[PDB]
PDB file of C-alpha atoms and ligand atoms in Angstrom:
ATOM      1  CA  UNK A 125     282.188  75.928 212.599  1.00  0.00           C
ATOM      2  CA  UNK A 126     279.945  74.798 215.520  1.00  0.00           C
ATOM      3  CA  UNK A 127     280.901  78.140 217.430  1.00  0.00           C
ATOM      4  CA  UNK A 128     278.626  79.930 214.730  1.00  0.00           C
ATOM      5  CA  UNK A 129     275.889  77.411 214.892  1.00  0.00           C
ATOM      6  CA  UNK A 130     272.134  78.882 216.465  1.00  0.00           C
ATOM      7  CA  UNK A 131     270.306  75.333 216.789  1.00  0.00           C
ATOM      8  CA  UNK A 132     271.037  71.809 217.175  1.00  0.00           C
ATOM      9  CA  UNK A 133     269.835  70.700 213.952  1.00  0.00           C
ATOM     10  CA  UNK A 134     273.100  71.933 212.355  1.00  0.00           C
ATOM     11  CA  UNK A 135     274.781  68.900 213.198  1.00  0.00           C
ATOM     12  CA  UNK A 136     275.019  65.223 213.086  1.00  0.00           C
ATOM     13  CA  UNK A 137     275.638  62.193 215.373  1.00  0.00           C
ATOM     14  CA  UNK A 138     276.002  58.464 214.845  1.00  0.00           C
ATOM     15  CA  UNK A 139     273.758  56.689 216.476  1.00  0.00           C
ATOM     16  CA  UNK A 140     275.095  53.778 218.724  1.00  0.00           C
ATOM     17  CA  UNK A 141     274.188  51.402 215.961  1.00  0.00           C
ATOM     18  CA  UNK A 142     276.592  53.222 213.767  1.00  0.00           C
ATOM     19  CA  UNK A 143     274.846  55.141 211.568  1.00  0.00           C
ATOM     20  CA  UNK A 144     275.125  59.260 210.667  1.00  0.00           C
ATOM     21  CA  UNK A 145     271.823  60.488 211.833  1.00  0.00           C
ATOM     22  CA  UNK A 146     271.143  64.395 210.545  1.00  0.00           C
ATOM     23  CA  UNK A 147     269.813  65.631 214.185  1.00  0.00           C
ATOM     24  CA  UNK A 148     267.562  68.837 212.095  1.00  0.00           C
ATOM     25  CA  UNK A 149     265.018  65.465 211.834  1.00  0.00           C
ATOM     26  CA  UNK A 150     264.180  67.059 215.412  1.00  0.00           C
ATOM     27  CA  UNK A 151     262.725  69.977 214.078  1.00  0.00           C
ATOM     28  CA  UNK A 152     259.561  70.225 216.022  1.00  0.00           C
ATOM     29  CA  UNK A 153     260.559  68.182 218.612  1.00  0.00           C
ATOM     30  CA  UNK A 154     261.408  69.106 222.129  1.00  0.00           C
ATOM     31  CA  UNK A 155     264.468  67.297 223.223  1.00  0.00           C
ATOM     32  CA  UNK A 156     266.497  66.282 226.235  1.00  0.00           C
ATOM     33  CA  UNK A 157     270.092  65.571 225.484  1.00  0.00           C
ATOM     34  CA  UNK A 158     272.156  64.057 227.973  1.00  0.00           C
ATOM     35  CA  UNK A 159     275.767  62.222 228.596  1.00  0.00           C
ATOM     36  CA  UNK A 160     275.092  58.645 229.678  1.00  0.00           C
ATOM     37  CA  UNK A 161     277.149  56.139 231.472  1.00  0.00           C
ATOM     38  CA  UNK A 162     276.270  53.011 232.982  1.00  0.00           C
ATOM     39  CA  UNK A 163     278.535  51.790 236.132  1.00  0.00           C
ATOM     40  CA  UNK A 164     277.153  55.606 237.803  1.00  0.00           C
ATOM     41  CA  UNK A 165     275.855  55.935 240.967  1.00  0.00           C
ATOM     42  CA  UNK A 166     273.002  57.650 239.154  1.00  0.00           C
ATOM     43  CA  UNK A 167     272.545  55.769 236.575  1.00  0.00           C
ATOM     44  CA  UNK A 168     269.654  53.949 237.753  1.00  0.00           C
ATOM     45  CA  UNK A 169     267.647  56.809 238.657  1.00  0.00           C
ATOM     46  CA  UNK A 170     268.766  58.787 235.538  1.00  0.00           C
ATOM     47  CA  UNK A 171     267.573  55.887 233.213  1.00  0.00           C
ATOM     48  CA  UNK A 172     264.370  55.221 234.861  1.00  0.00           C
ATOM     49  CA  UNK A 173     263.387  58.611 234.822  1.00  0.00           C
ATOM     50  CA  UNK A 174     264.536  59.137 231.419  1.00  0.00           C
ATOM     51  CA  UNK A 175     262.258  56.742 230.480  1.00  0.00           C
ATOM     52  CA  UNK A 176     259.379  57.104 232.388  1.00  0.00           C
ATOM     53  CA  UNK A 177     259.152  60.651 230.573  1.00  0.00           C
ATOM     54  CA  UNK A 178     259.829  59.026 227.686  1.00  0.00           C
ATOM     55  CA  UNK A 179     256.654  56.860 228.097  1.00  0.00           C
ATOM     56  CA  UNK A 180     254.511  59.708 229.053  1.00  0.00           C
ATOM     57  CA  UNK A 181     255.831  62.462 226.430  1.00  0.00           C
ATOM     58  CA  UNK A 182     256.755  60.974 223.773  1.00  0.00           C
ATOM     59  CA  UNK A 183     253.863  60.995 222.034  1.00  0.00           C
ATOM     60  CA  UNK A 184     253.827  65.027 222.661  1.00  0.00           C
ATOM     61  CA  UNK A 185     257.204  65.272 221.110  1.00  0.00           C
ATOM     62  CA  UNK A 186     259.516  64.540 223.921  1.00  0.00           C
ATOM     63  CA  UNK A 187     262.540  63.466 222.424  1.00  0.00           C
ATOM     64  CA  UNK A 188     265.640  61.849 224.101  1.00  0.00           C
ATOM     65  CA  UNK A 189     269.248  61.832 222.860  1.00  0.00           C
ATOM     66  CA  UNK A 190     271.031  59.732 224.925  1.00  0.00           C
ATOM     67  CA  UNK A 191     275.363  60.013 224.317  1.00  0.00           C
ATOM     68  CA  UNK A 192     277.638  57.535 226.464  1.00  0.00           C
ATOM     69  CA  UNK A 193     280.738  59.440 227.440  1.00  0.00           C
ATOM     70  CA  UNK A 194     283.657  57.552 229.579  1.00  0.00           C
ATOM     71  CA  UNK A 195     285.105  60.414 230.971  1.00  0.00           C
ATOM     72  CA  UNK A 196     283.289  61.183 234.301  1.00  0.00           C
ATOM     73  CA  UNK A 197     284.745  57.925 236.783  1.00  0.00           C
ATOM     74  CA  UNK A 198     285.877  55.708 233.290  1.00  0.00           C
ATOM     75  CA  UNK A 199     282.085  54.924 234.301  1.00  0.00           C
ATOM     76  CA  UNK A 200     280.861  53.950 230.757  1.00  0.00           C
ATOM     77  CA  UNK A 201     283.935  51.236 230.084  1.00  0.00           C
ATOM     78  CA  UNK A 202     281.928  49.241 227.651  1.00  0.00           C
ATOM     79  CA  UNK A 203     281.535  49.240 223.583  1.00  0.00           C
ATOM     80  CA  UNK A 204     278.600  50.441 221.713  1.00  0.00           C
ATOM     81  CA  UNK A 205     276.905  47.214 221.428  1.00  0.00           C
ATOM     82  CA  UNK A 206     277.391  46.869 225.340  1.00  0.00           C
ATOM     83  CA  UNK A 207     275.631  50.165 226.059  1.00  0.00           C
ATOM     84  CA  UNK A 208     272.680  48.942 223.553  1.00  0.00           C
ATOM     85  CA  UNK A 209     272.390  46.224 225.361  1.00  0.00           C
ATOM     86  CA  UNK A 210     272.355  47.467 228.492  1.00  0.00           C
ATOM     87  CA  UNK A 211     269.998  50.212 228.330  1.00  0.00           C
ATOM     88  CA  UNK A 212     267.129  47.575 226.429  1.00  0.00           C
ATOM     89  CA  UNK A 213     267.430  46.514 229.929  1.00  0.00           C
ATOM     90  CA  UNK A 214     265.631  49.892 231.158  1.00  0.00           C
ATOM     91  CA  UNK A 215     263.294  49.668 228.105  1.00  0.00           C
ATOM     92  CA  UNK A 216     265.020  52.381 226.347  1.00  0.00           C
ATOM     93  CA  UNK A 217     262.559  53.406 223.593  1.00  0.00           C
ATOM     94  CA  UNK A 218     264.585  57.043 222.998  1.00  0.00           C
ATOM     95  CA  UNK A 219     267.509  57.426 220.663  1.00  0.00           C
ATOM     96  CA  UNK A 220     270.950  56.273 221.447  1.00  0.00           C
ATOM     97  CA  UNK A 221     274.168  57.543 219.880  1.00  0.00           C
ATOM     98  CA  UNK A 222     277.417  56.234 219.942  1.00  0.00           C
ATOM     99  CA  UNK A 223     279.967  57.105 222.463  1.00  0.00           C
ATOM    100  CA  UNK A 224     282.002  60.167 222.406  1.00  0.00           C
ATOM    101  CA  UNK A 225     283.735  62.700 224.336  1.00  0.00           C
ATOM    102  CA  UNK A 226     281.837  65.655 225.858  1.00  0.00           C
ATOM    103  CA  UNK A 227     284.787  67.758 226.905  1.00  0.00           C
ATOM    104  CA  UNK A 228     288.227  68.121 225.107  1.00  0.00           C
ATOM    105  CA  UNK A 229     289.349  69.560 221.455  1.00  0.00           C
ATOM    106  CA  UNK A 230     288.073  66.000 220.361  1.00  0.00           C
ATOM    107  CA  UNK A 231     284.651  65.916 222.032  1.00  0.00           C
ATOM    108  CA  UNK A 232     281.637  66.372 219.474  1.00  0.00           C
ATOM    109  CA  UNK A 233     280.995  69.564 218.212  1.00  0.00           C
ATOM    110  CA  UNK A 234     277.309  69.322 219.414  1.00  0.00           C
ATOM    111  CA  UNK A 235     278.581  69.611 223.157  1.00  0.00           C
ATOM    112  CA  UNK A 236     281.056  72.291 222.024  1.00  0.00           C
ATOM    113  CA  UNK A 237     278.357  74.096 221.174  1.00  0.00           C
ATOM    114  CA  UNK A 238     276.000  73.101 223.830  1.00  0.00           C
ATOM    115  CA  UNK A 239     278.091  74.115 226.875  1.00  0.00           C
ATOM    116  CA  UNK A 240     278.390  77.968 225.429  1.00  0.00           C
ATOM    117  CA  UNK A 241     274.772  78.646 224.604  1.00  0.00           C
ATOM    118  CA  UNK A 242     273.831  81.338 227.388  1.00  0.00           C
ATOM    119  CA  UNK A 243     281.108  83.969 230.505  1.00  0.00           C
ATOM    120  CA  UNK A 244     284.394  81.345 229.156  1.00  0.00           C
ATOM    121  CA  UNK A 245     284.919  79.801 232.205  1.00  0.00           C
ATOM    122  CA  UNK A 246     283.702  77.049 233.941  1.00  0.00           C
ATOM    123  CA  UNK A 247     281.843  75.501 231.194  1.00  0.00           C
ATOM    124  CA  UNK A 248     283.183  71.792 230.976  1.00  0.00           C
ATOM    125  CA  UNK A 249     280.644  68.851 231.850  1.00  0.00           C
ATOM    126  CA  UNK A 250     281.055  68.195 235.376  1.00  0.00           C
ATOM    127  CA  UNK A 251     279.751  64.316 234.888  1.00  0.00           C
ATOM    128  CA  UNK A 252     277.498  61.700 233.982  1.00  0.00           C
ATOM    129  CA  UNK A 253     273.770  62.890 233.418  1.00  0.00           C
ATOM    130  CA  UNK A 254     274.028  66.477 232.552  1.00  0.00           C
ATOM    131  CA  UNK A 255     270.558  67.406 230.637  1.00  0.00           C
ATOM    132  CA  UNK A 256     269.762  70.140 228.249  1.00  0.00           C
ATOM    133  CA  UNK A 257     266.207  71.318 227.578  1.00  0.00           C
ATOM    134  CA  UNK A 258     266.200  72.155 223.825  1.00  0.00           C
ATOM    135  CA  UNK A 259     262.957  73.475 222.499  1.00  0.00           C
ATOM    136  CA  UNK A 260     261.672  73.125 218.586  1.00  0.00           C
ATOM    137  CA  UNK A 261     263.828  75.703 217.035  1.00  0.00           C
ATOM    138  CA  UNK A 262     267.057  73.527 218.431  1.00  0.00           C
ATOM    139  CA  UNK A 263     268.186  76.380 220.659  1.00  0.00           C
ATOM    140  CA  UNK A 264     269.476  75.653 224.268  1.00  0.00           C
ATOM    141  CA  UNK A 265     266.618  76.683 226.912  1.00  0.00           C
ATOM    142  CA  UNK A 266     267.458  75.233 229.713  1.00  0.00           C
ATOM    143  CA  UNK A 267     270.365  72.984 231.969  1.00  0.00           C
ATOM    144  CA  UNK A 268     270.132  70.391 234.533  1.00  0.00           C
ATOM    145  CA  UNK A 269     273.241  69.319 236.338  1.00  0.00           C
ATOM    146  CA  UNK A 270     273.886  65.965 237.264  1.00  0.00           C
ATOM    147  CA  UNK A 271     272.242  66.328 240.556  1.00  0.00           C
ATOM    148  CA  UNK A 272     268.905  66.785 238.966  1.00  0.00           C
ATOM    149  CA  UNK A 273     267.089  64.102 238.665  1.00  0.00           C
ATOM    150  CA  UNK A 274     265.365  63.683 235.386  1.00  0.00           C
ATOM    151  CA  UNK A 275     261.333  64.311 237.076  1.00  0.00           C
ATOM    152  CA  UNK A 276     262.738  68.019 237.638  1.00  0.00           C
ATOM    153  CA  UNK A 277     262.473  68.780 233.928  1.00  0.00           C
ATOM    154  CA  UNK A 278     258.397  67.853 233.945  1.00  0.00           C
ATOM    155  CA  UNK A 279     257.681  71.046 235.400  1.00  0.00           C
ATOM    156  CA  UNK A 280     259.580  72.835 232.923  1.00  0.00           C
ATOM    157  CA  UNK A 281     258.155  70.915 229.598  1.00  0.00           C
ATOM    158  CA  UNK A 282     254.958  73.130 229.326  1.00  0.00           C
ATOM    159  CA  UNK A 283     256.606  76.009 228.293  1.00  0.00           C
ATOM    160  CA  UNK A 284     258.324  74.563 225.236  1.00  0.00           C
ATOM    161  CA  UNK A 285     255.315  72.250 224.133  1.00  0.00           C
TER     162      UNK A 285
HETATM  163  C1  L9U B 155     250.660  64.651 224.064  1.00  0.00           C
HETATM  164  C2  L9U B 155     250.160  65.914 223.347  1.00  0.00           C
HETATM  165  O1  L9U B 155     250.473  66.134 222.224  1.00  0.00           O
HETATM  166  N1  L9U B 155     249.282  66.848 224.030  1.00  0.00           N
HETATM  167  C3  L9U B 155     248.769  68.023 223.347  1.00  0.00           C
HETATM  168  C4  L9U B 155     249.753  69.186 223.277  1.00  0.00           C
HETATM  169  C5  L9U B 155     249.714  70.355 224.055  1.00  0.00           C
HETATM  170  C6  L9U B 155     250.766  71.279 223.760  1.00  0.00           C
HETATM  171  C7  L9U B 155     251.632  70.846 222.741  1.00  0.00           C
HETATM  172  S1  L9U B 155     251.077  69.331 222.232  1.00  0.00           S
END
């Protein structure tokens, strides 16, 4: 199972619309997947940011996957169609998945995998607005906690381009 996998276009997501999206459709891309919440103390700087590179790499391949998770402070309470909402607000133009679990036997297998790519311990998400770097190949390059703010990554983007 996800264990095995090598890149993050093994797996699938639904989107916060509802919808199974294959994620290999990022082949090529270079992606920044993070665990969103809303009612965060960084969640206005995290968002802003997000999008801001968003604006200015997208068109370079700069993807964003964007998963609400409730279990840092309860601090993404709302439904689906509430988190939509609320990050058209920030002018979200990157993808948005539906909420899940990060850490746990039921969080999604992506993370699973995520959180092992290069000891057992000490993994777990720590909370809202983790960021990992993946490059085109869908391996893991690189980890941001949630103390780094998204404008960190910039530096790093080059390399994986
Ligand atoms: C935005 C964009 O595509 N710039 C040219 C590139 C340089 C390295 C990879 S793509």
């Amino acid at each position: 199972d996800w264990r095995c996998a090598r890149s993050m276009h093994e797996f699938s997501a639904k989107d916060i619309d509802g919808h199974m999206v294959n994620l290999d459709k990022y082949r090529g891309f270079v992606c920044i997947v993070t665990n969103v919440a809303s009612q965060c103390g960084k969640t206005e700087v995290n968002y802003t940011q997000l999008v801001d590179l968003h604006a200015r790499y997208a068109e370079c391949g700069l993807r964003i996957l964007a998963f609400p998770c409730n279990q840092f402070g309860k601090q993404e309470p709302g439904s689906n169609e509430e988190i939509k909402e609320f990050a058209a607000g920030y002018n979200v133009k990157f993808d948005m998945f539906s909420k899940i679990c990060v850490n746990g036997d039921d969080a999604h297998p992506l993370w699973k995998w995520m959180k092992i790519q290069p000891g057992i311990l000490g993994n777990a998400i720590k909370w809202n607005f983790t960021k990992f770097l993946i490059d085109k190949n869908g391996c893991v390059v690189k980890h941001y906690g949630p103390m780094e703010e998204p404008l960190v990554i910039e530096k790093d983007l080059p390399h994986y381009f």
